[model samples]
Target: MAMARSISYITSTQLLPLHRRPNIAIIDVRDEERNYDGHIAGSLHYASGSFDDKISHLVQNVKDKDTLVFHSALSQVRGPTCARRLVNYLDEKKEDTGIKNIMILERGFNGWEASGKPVCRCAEVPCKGDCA
Candidate 1:
């Protein structure tokens, strides 16, 4: 069996400054509920349910970006999986997407919140609850 490729982890502190940068793409892989509840400001939502189908779309969306940061509620499963899938796809396609960095948000959204980083909460209209 081939060994899986490993991606690095980035902490919320390190991510804060880069979150809003144009060349850095922050991908939130959480479900709709968790994402809308609160998420890193300016992060893009790619809910894990259909992430595979959307990989090409994601590549197009971030083609100009130099870095990609993927995360779920935690940095464990979904986030890493998606990141690896993307790297593998990129390797296969060799599309020159300009993505030089692929990393996971250490501890994900939960840690970002705990670290006192700012989050964007959904407006009351679409938010069922947990709107702040």
Candidate 2:
């Protein structure tokens, strides 16, 4: 039998332990409105709606070999899809983001909150004029 290739899938709670990994980038993939309140600390905002514009830079900036974790209010299959798309995009890009790891929040933000991990609030991110 051929070895089974793993697809990225992880709980938000699992992220805390991987912080020591280099170039790890955590992202919140949800709508802008619902996310305005709070999000997991150190995670950037990457709404599925604005993926085209936001994804490339993210893929380009993080370490190509490092893991990139995507989280949201809930874990939809889309979260996994996002990681796949990013990997393919990086493969085609001229530069490397040092992002080898790509996975999604285990249960998502809502699931993380339910578990009482930790949360923080931020203003959108790279707001206005200054963007990648």
Candidate 3:
């Protein structure tokens, strides 16, 4: 078995500039409702329900040196779990030429929005809960 690797954390401040970069891919692993309510601008929504099945799709078009940032509501459980899973998958595959950096957003979307960072909200479905 391959040894487990630790995933790093990227603060909202640190991610602000890079979030818009082509080499950075932000993944939101919250539920569909939470994700549609509000998410980091340009982030890809991969509802935690089927995140595992989408790992390949996530890395399909990625190039070497690209960064993948995963996050949930609080960056506590779901976010880190998904990030570790991706790391493990990569390690097990022994594949080269894709995904070098894997990080979990510190404090997740709550922190990002609290920090006054940009967020995208769905207009068709109004946010039901404490979205702010």
Candidate 4:
């Protein structure tokens, strides 16, 4: 049997334990509406509606030393696919982009909220929720 390769994961609990936090980047691949409604604080939005092509450039910026977490509402689909696409993209890029660590948020936003992590709404300031 061949070994099963897999992306890593940083659970909500693990993320909070660090006093100053690690050098981590989060890629939220949900739709624009859901993302603007509410998302994990400091997460960068990536549109997976077009899948790999739309996100290829964004993924290239992730360094190998930095742990990148791909997340959506559910980890079952979008998160995994985005992570896979990112890894594939990195593989073809100029040697050693240093993006070795790729992860998916366990259960995505739902799990993050359920786990009591901080969630930030993009439209929570002055005026209506149309700040976009």
Candidate 5:
């Protein structure tokens, strides 16, 4: 008997198939370190630390009412929080953007990667070694 957390969360298994949706977009809200290491295909790096700041562009560019799936680590340490914020932010801006259908990947990126799904590495940039 597991009680659900206050915020709803969707596992990678649940969110992966969503990629098929013509309008749905998946955001890898993992830490910047992980973003550089690898990320799910077609997933944009919405760094957990910078979620609030970067969420607007997502809805603005893809304002289709399609679910904005957020996934971090399997533990969901960041995704749920990010999702909740995005959901609330969108609601606040409904008059302006009218975007809806936001979802937080339940299990997070770890689950998605573990499921044998596609993941890609970031292109190395011209930066000092170990510099994000």
Candidate 6:
């Protein structure tokens, strides 16, 4: 069971530490190449097409006060869209359940990089053309 949550926007400066929280989930919706190049530490990668699956799985048996934050490279759409989808699903299930559960990283990973914070890179960028 899950509750509808207030979707809040958070800047990279404010988001840097959230990954360390056991109850917090940082989901990154980005191209696989970019994701392989770098992503926020502890962030789980998912395509926007599959974000619904990620949320449905993550939200189950979730602890109270848990926060699910989503981000992307520019975050102009991908991140927010995914967050809203999850929120809508929860609202459909529980219109009155208590507890906040959703958040978004402002400006996405671009903001994180602009802040001079380090991002974790797993593999080399594999894109043949534009990496964006």
Query: What TM value does model 5 have?
Result: 0.50
Better of 4 and 6 by lDDT: 6
Candidate 3 lDDT score at position 68: 64
Task: Name the 10 consecutive residues with the lowest summed lDDT in model 6.
Answer: 123-132
Candidate 4 lDDT, tens digit per residue, 10-49? 5567456532335566666556656555434445665554
For candidate 6, write residues 24-123 as lDDT tens digits. Answer: 6556655555564643443556565554454566556466657666664545767666656666656656442232456765664565456656654334
How many backbone clashes does every candidate have? 0, 17, 0, 4, 4, 0
TM-score to true structure, per model = 0.53, 0.51, 0.55, 0.52, 0.50, 0.52
Q: How many backbone overlaps does candidate 2 show? A: 17
- Leading candidate by TM-score: 3
Task: Please give the lDDT score at residue 127 for candidate 6.
Answer: 35
Report the lDDT tens digits of candidate 1 across residue range 1-132. 442243566565856655656666556655656555653443456555543556666666655646766664556566656666666656656653445576666664575466656554555543421232
Better of 2 and 3 by TM-score: 3
- List CA RMSD, all candidates: 6.9, 6.7, 7.1, 6.2, 7.2, 7.8
Ranking by TM-score: 3, 1, 4, 6, 2, 5
Give the lowest summed-lDDT range of ten residues in model 4. Answer: 123-132
What RMSD value applies to candidate 4? 6.2
**Candidate 5 residue spans exceeding 4 A from truth:** 1-7, 10-20, 30-34, 47-53, 72-75, 87-98, 106-108, 111-132
Model 3, position 90, has a per-residue lDDT of 62
Predicted candidate 3 versus true structure: per-residue lDDT over 11-84, tens digit per residue: 55766645645676656655655554553444556554543456666567666548766664556666657656
Pick by lDDT: 2 or 5, better one = 2
| Model 2 global lDDT (CA atoms, 0 to 1) | 0.53
What residue runs in model 6 are displaced by over 4 Å at the alpha carbon? Answer: 1-5, 12-21, 30-34, 38-40, 47-51, 72-74, 87-99, 111-132
**Per-residue alpha-carbon lDDT of candidate 2 for residues 1-132, written as tens digits (9 for 90 to 100):** 442233455544555656546565556655644664543444556555544556576555654556666654444556656665565655666444445655655554554456755454345555431111
Instruction: Assess candidate 1 and give its TM-score to the true structure.
Output: 0.53
* Total colliding residue pairs, candidate 3: 0
Which sections of candidate 2 miss by over 4 Å? Answer: 1-6, 11-20, 38-42, 47-50, 73-77, 80-98, 115-132
